[PDB]
């Protein structure tokens, strides 16, 4: 179905309709069309005129409706004013019986038709307008992913005296990651972390949480299962065709979906509420389990590069009246990501993402790719996006001055630490010839050792039927 | 259909190996034990189950005899042809007699094979619904018959009427549940500030303690196939299931676990561990999801999502080992709750409250002043070989033979109700909440007070103004 969750949500009266800045769009349609085309998303410049026109038609329809409503209360007076005036038996057939009372039922007849038309026009507008992307920062590089601009390169490739191995091989030998023999247990791409592997995840998560909490971020825990409206509000797609979002059985539980990032739950917390101006900027940090269907995306059958479940610590910000505040907060979040990766001793590159890779909600987006020796490639480990007022206008995330005046806040989100790919980068960058893996000083307090070595336990032995004999 | 049987039908694993010889040997003891649990099956069902099993063994013997006779016939034919050395052997009365019996045998087998598959399924579909054995000392009866084994601490004294955790938390803005119906649904919540620090602290305090006591930390998938749940003694298909399943029309056989116990069992499934490593002690922190359709609207006592650190064990050749491990897990739970400064009581759960997989089950209830009663905060169960026989969780003996291991599970710390007990036990008259020394390193304070931020204000259309 093409039913928009934000619109349906509003239709039921659960929240108000999203408040889009049509004044700006109608004032500068040419600029909007050009930026729209450069994103190469669903909607293109050819679609804009129709969207603007539907909005304009709706505005006039509402003007016509109001006009007819006011006129009805004017005709109701042509009768009310005549209940104690010549109301013997004259009014029942006076010259003002027809033409001044028959035009009262004609108005009712019209309004009964216009109200439904208004609803139809309104849905027509939102179904399309809500698929329009956010504006684009003037400095965003134009083009596909390959056009990303390298802003910083930190460190250099680790040098080995042997061919670096992949993280899965390294981990299986140390029995800290397991993916084999799980198709009928937990499915493809699923995995278990054991011993030092689990300690590595706990260490990464706690190192990151500790750092951010110490830096003034408010810790939060959010629901993992959320209604589709929240995803739509964030600029995600609960159900495009192959959808990245897992949904709970609709025949058993109504509208429940697993989030692919704590960003969803965090946005849901602020939905329909206002924060105090004095508290801006609001900085929050949240660790949660993320779920992603990963359909039609990169083929990564083995290894932790594109898994269905993983833990991620998320940074989320709600700020000021405008761009200066949100742009600065994005810069702050990025600097924190760089600090985390630098302290982990990883080689990485910071990228200014191009127009076709911003998505729908992003105005500006900075990603960081970490060098992964075994994979032999730079791989994205974090993303940071300034969504300006795209999410706030859809989910009504406001800020309030001391006086009570409400304005749309801006929202910013950024990866604090996504475990899977950091495990890849760490295991592959710190691997030793003998198969052991050195532990970065920053994580040693969590690992209780400076080197991960072969375990004492005997690895599990498969005793099932599906084996050669 | 039974997920365990289907799983085997597809050849993904062998069929569960139930201890029928023990059952058939002492059907009377099993009969009374079954009735005392007052579960699905009762004494009036054992005779049928035992009969089907016997009919199945006989059918298999009959099939074996026929398959063996078929070979004997084929050999008699080969020997006849070689012995007669004639171009017209087909016309020999004996040759035709053997060939006829050969075709008859094959016909009879075409009848027995389908019957065998049928009986086998009928047996498992019913036999798999039988509970584990029951420990001799288990108290008989319903929950009211739970036996108090020990009590630790004393009820806190207040100079005022203790308030409930939600009121306390909303005032401090550390828990939110209001206006979430269309965001995350009923019985969902957010923890903020000190509230989130409390969860972080509880989880880390428990994880650190257990890791330092020798438990191997683990991370498990949260989405698993139905077979693993069934193997643990849970019910993904009991119509009103407490297990959330991913939309079947989009993704096949994927379910959210209500405890890391499921994933941990899935790890050992179809594998064998070395005897020298027993007992295997693992600890795992995971997000748990429970539909709680049966019953429950406000408060954290019964929610749909929560974080829980789980203890899981795989041990020795028999009962002595699994029993001692359960005791070990219980003692650890008591240490954790005592160090958090909570008042609690240990219970030996009764026959009707063991469920299907448990042989022995100890629960701990913590005093919750605001609630005005004790509430279960942990459970610990010895499942002996109930899960292992269903998921083939083995161990290799000294001699080098495979035997079914025993599994044990226990709550390390379940956050929701611990928050209730902590908030309600340490609340102060002015609304602040004192922090237990053990949790102070994680909270950075000895007292949780009113937050600095201005609480969020609802600005939606559904309000008077
Ligand atoms: N299938 C998968 N397997 C392994 N790692 C994956 C993954 N999908 C995403 N990630 C990791 O999570 C980080 C997040 O995602 P993005 O989805 O880019 O950001 C957001 O979610 C924003 N809320 C900021 O974090 C990525 O940069 C990547 O390292
Ligand atoms: N809906 C809910 N809301 C809040 N807390 C809940 C809950 N369902 C269960 N719990 C908490 O998690 C612990 C777990 O469960 P049980 O299901 O008893 O055990 C097992 O799972 C075994 N694997 C041992 O932990 C319980 O003792 C209880 O404190």
């Amino acid at each position: 179905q093409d039913r928009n969750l934000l619109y349906e949500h509003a239709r039921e009266g659960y929240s108000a309709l999203p408040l889009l800045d049509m004044e700006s769009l109608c004032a500068y349609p040419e600029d909007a069309a050009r930026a729209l085309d450069l994103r190469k998303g669903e909607l293109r410049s050819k679609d804009l005129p129709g969207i603007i026109s539907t909005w304009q038609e709706l505005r006039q329809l509402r003007e016509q409706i109001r006009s007819l409503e006011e006129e009805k209360e004017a005709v109701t007076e042509a009768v009310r004013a005549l209940v104690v005036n010549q109301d013997n038996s004259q009014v029942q057939q006076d010259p003002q019986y027809q033409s001044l009372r028959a035009r009262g039922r004609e108005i009712r007849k019209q309004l009964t038709l216009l109200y439904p038309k208004e609803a139809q026009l309104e849905e027509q507008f939102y179904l399309r307008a809500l698929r329009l992307p956010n504006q684009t920062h003037p400095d965003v590089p134009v083009g596909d992913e390959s056009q990303a601009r390298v802003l910083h390169v930190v460190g250099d490739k680790p040098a080995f005296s042997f061919q670096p191995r992949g993280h899965l091989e390294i981990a299986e030998k140390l029995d800290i990651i397991r993916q084999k023999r799980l198709s009928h247990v937990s499915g493809h791409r699923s995995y278990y972390l054991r011993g030092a592997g689990a300690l590595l995840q706990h260490g990464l998560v706690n190192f990151t949480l500790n750092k951010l909490i110490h830096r003034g971020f408010t810790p939060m825990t959010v629901p993992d299962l959320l209604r589709g409206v929240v995803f739509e509000g964030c600029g995600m797609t609960p159900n495009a065709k192959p959808s990245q979002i897992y949904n709970i059985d609709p025949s058993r539980f109504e509208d429940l979906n697993l989030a692919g990032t704590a960003e969803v739950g965090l946005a849901g917390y602020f939905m329909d509420h206002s924060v105090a101006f004095r508290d801006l900027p609001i900085r929050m940090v949240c660790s949660s389990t993320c779920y992603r269907a990963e359909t039609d995306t990169g083929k990564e059958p083995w290894g932790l590069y594109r898994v269905h479940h993983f833990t991620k610590v998320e940074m989320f910000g709600v700020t000021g009246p405008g761009l200066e505040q949100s742009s600065e907060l994005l810069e702050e979040f990025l600097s924190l990501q760089m600090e985390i990766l630098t302290e982990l001793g990883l080689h990485f590159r910071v990228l200014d993402m191009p127009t076709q890779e911003l998505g729908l909600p992003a105005y500006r987006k900075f990603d960081i790719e970490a060098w992964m020796p075994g994979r032999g490639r730079f791989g994205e480990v974090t993303s940071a996006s300034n969504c300006t007022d795209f999410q706030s206008r859809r989910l009504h995330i406001m800020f309030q001055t001391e006086a009570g005046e409400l304005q749309f806040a801006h929202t910013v989100n950024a990866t604090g630490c996504a475990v899977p790919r950091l495990l890849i980068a760490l295991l592959e960058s710190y691997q030793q010839k003998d198969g052991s893996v050195l532990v970065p000083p920053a994580l040693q307090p969590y690992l209780g050792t400076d080197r991960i070595t072969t375990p004492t336990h005997v690895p599990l032995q498969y005793i099932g039927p599906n084996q050669p004999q």
Side-chain angles (χ1 to χ4, degrees), chain A residues 170-459:
Chain A
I170 294 172
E172 294 181 323
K173 296 187 183 306
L174 293 167
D175 202 20
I176 57 178
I177 293 179
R178 171 188 169 182
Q179 282 201 299
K180 295 196 289 186
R181 300 283 189 183
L182 294 176
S183 57
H184 303 300
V185 172
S186 42
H188 297 325
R189 302 194 182 188
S190 65
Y191 60 97
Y192 284 80
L193 255 33
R194 176 175 179 168
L199 292 178
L200 238 24
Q201 168 163 307
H202 300 319
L204 286 168
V205 172
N206 287 319
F207 165 85
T208 306
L209 284 173
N210 183 63
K211 177 182 249 292
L212 298 174
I213 288 168
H214 183 64
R215 294 290 284 278
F217 282 66
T218 291
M220 303 281 286
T221 69
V222 305
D224 325 64
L225 289 170
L226 298 128
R227 272 66 165 76
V229 61
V230 190
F231 293 79
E232 179 66 38
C234 287
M236 304 166 161
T237 66
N239 185 57
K241 286 54 67 235
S243 183
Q244 277 265 35
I245 302 162
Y246 285 114
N247 64 312
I248 300 303
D249 190 334
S251 68
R252 314 318 310 178
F253 300 101
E254 171 184 53
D255 196 9
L256 285 182
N257 310 270
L258 288 171
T261 168
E263 168 195 347
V264 184
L266 264 0
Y269 177 77
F270 294 98
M271 180 181 186
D272 285 349
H273 287 72
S274 66
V275 299
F277 182 103
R278 70 171 68 176
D279 289 331
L280 304 173
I282 297 175
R283 298 181 176 83
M284 289 176 159
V285 59
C286 174
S287 176
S288 76
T289 300
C290 300
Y291 305 85
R292 302 198 187 191
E294 297 299 342
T295 302
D296 80 71
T297 55
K299 213 64 182 179
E300 301 282 345
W302 299 89
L304 306 182
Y305 199 86
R306 192 165 288 106
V307 288
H308 298 301
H309 64 87
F310 62 95
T311 297
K312 175 173 62 60
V313 174
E314 179 78 357
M315 281 183 271
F316 189 90
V318 175
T319 187
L323 286 175
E324 179 159 27
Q325 289 74 32
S326 57
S327 294
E328 282 299 304
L329 192 55
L330 171 60
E331 292 293 331
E332 180 186 331
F333 282 8
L334 173 62
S335 73
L336 285 167
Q337 297 173 315
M338 290 174 71
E339 289 188 3
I340 290 165
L341 301 177
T342 298
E343 298 183 20
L344 291 177
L346 297 172
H347 170 41
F348 62 93
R349 51 157 57 150
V350 181
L351 307 177
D352 193 1
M353 303 311 281
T355 58
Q356 302 184 193
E357 293 302 309
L358 290 177
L360 208 62
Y363 175 76
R364 190 74 182 275
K365 185 170 188 288
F366 301 123
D367 287 5
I368 299 181
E369 298 183 318
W371 174 246
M372 299 165 182
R375 179 180 179 77
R377 305 176 57 189
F378 271 97
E380 182 193 319
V381 288
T382 68
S383 72
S385 304
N386 176 1
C387 300
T388 63
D389 58 2
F390 180 97
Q391 309 182 317
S392 63
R393 278 176 176 278
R394 295 154 82 87
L395 299 172
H396 300 83
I397 297 169
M398 330 295 287
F399 65 91
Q400 186 184 314
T401 60
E402 296 296 326
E405 170 180 348
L406 297 174
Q407 304 176 234
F408 289 109
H410 280 197
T411 55
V412 184
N413 69 75
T415 307
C417 78
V419 179
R421 298 180 189 173
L422 286 183
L423 287 179
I424 295 179
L426 290 171
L427 293 175
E428 294 183 3
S429 297
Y430 287 96
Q431 65 179 296
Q432 303 294 292
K433 189 172 183 180
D434 66 2
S436 64
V437 178
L438 295 184
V439 180
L443 298 179
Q444 284 178 28
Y446 303 96
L447 269 283
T449 183
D450 60 10
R451 179 194 300 264
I452 297 170
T453 60
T454 56
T456 299
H457 74 271
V458 178

Side-chain angles (χ1 to χ4, degrees), chain A residues 153-175:
Chain A
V153 178
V154 174
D156 206 334
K157 295 185 182 182
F160 303 93
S161 64
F162 58 102
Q163 167 61 46
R165 295 122 175 173
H167 70 284
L168 190 54
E169 183 186 330
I170 294 172
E172 294 181 323
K173 296 187 183 306
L174 293 167
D175 202 20

Side-chain angles (χ1 to χ4, degrees), chain A residues 38-58:
Chain A
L38 259 24
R39 289 200 175 221
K40 260 69 188 301
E42 183 181 1
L43 298 178
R44 302 300 171 83
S45 55
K46 77 179 190 304
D47 304 302
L48 273 181
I51 295 170
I52 290 175
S53 181
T54 298
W55 181 245
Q56 288 170 168
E57 180 186 354
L58 176 56

